[model samples]
Target: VQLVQSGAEVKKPGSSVKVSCKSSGGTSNNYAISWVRQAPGQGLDWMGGISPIFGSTAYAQKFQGRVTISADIFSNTAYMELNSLTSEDTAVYFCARHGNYYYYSGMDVWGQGTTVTVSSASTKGPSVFPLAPSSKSTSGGTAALGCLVKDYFPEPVTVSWNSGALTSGVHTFPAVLQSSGLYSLSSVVTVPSSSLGTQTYICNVNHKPSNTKVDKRVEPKS
Candidate 1:
């Protein structure tokens, strides 16, 4: 038997949260992961499903306004981003195969039990945001957020927070690669912590522009 299960979550009343799973064993390579939300005590509601092999995805009609599902094929991981979360959003979510849902198309195989607590983190910004380590750092401060990205081809990457004015540059493309088959380029910046809106970050993925960017956003919390 294969399994996929809850990874991380944070939520509150009238807020939003997310739960995730990573697939292992069985015929995961042949099937897809479908996300369904459950009210505190109700059965799961069909959210949407994503297929890694096809690089294609579809969502349920009722899920249009509320849910977003994304996956990383390389990692064999799937995600569920729940928006406008509330106490009503509390429940055990499930990520199953398509055949399990419709007697023919929902998840039949499931992961072991895992619980994601939907509680208050803060009522202000997002409810729960994944903690990404510092990707870029300043030469000024003792901290090193400075990072050197190299050997990336076709420019499959992104520099986050370009709209802000600070002591840093936004996504400077490399003109050439060195003899080592790696592009040696450095980006360093310093932003007044006071002026920061969303915590600054960057991601360099090989995914195409048509790929979903939903997970790039911070969750409803810190």
Candidate 2:
């Protein structure tokens, strides 16, 4: 497989730039290429990527708030960029064929590569809250949902109660940041069980709208 990407982008501190790669050869439409980062002046690194065709993705454990990846299936292009760049951000950007059939998780194809230069210091995005808290009660009882997530960015992921399933109760979210800087969003729902076995719970994360919905689960186990 081959990729021809947009040229290198140069920026000073406090600026952001975007680059893109067009897929050619093989079933590039069927597979996804991940956008990875190599910290300027350092070894190679991995960032998050988007696969609109499959809508599945993965990320580098520590790449949160630093980079994001998106794709345009219509154009057969995989786009990646840094929101804010600094001297620490100067690095070569590459798009590689992925293994997980998605992006970032695994790469089987690769592009020629492009370089982005960040001249000043870099800054990370501030933590953002989840969409909303969710709750479900067992009729006339208390409904409670706790937010507990630990793996990726604490700000990009979230949980919220939906009348689509939950009835009534208080929901809470607690953020846990590991020593390695990874984070988790944990949530609990206390509300109606919804006709015993017909209940549903939805868990969502912050990604592009096309790839935002994930896991709409049923209660009482399969």
Candidate 3:
């Protein structure tokens, strides 16, 4: 069984967003589809479950009035919609197959998560910090530098080094939400130790919602 989910979404506060999950292998009507969400830096919460064949749904108490779960047996698709969105509703939503239980049940197959970002008027941009290599490297060895991006809103940002001059051996982590209701992410790039003292690395950040870019440079020390 395969479940495919929709793409990432960005919505303003007080608006609504609908996410869809399409099922394959003719199992959509046989099993229940359960909706789950994970907030930034938070654990998974089962929102509800719905049966496509019966058109029945059961939601968690907190989501009963604000969320709606529906399904279409003919198309083998399930959908979840949340209204009156707020910053608290910013999360990654998922649809999973439940073992024939119209209510909450074990999730068997899960769809790729869909990121939902709810932005308000007070949205903030990321603070960028470029970090130098921490350890001394031998002539043939490689050293690593990091770019820390923190306290951003709307969750989507891109990180690049030297305008994509160095793309290989680069790792960008997923964004993590902080207790302050902002998000943080880090990226690391590897460089030849022999060139460290002579080369300067630039970290570029593009914040999507703000249409702004921030750049920071890291120069090797000693």
Candidate 4:
């Protein structure tokens, strides 16, 4: 089974956006479709679910009045629409297939995430922390370094590393939303122990909303 989702959207405050999730392989008729969302640097929150065949719906209390979840049986598609959007509504929305019994079973199929950015005049830039490397190497003789980018608005940021000639094994995690309603993200790079002593790793952060860039550097202690 597969689910295809709509593309990313940039919306203004007080505007609305509709995201579509189309199911393939006849899965829509056999399973229930659910909506989930993740704010930048935050955990997943289940928005609601709908059964196409029964025309029944269920929603999370937090989203009850703010969003609508619907399904079209003829097109085998599920849709989620959020109204009166705000910065707090900026998140990556996902559609998933639940078991025939709905919430009883875990999600079996998921759609590609659709990102929604609510752009407002009150935009904030991220604060990038200094790059830090693990003090000790693993048994395999490799070290890990991490860079944290936090408290960003509008949820669009790019993080890259500069470690001279060392390149590869870089992992950038998804931006999460914190309780403060801002976003945070992390990136890590792994390198051989021998290179740690000789090279310094620099983390570069570009915050799109503010057109600001920041860099932090760290050299691992021997």
Candidate 5:
């Protein structure tokens, strides 16, 4: 489907703005529309989403009370309204169709981003580090692989795992905002133990500003 979004918004901290995404052509109203945010020089933040066909909505705890997501099937449009805006809220917002079963991977279709800038907001790129991935044997004849990203900025980073072609059954844990206001996060993967020596698991850490990416790989002990 085709998704069209609203224009840029420059607002004060106490004011509010509503961004819209109108879809057409493909499976417009069939899937939910998710709103994603990216502050200048930062990684992604899934704000929330709405099911245009059902009027149902789901939001990230980080934005539960700060933002509102709504959908209008009659107009084939999804909306996000941010209230009490702040410098931290200044960012580019995007709308996309959500996937069926996956939470971290979706947005099969994307809408052009709508930029929002609060007067005093500024951003800095994160320092990325993909710590060497590690693995250990498990009871199921499989191995549990771990990946870590350290010392990141702007509060968000995306970490993922790949064994040749992205191993399934991955669990990316929640990010922990460090005392410095920076952030770090991790992810895990499962694979057959027999393949550990022959296969390589890659940990991908992605950040913004320059959209830098760091990758690390590890294999099981002989």
Candidate 6:
């Protein structure tokens, strides 16, 4: 079976975020999902898990009151909500498949971890500047183009690329939080060279701290 997890989440202290593990394949329904946590550079802890087939759940005593575990049998998904989050709760959460019985097999299948960050440090929002957008070429089609973001602050900013007209394959890299209290993010899109003359691409950035939404449009590299 395959387990795909949600992306990273960053929230202020006292806020909450729900992380999900969606299962796929022949064993998605055959195995129960157990949630585990690993703090930055720390050992892993078994938070708990729920059986989709029986609607039964069990939690490690330490996590019993701080987390809620649930599953949706029809959707083949399991979720964990960590409440009243604090800096101590900042960690990476992973979900793995275990046997259905009370005494089950070890977690043989695991999901890509979802990182949760709880930060209460007072800071300003990010300032985004769309740097030089560049591209390369091959035989016939347009190769690749990138959107660069620099000098952003407070770490967690949402960045997206939208094609002005057609569907484009876009991939965004993780934002790097610099020691100087700023961040950098970038994304790239691959499109057809033929559309360079007519198509437009937009980079949209959302910074929740300062409640800012910024967009910049650039023409495809020729």
Using Cα atoms with residue i matched to residue i, what is each candidate's TM-score against the true structure? 0.46, 0.48, 0.69, 0.58, 0.51, 0.57
Lowest lDDT sum, 10 consecutive residues, model 2, at 121-130
Q: State the lDDT of candidate 6 residue by residue for 1-222, as single tens digits.
A: 689999988777788789999987754666678899998779999998887667688899987788998877778788999989887887899988875544277888899999887776445655554443343544565656666767665666777777234345777788765444356788777777666566666777687877877777756334
lDDT of 2 at 100: 57
Candidate 3 ranges with C-alpha deviation above 4 Å? 121-155, 163-198, 206-222
Cα lDDT tens digits, model 5, 62-122, are: 9989899887767778889999987788789998887652335567888999987665322
Give the candidates in order of TM-score, highest first. 3, 4, 6, 5, 2, 1
- Model 2 vs truth, CA RMSD: 16.8
Question: Local error of candidate 2 at 82, Å?
Answer: 1.1
- Of the two candidates 2 and 6, the one with more favorable lDDT, higher being better, is 6
Better of 1 and 3 by lDDT: 3
**Which runs of model 6 end up more than 4 angstroms from their true locations?**
99-103, 121-222
Each candidate's clash count: 23, 37, 0, 8, 0, 1
List the lowest-lDDT window of 10 residues for candidate 1: 122-131
lDDT of 6: 0.74
- RMSD (Cα, Å) of model 1: 17.9
Across residues 114-148, which tens digit of lDDT does each residue of candidate 1 receive?
44445443222111123322432232222223334
Residue 181 of model 3: what lDDT?
59
C-alpha local distance difference test of each model: 0.51, 0.58, 0.84, 0.82, 0.72, 0.74
Please report how far candidate 6 places residue 195 from its true position, in Å.
44
Error of 3 at 209 (Å): 6.9
- The residue-level lDDT of candidate 4 at 144 comes to 78
Q: What is the model-wide C-alpha lDDT for candidate 3?
A: 0.84
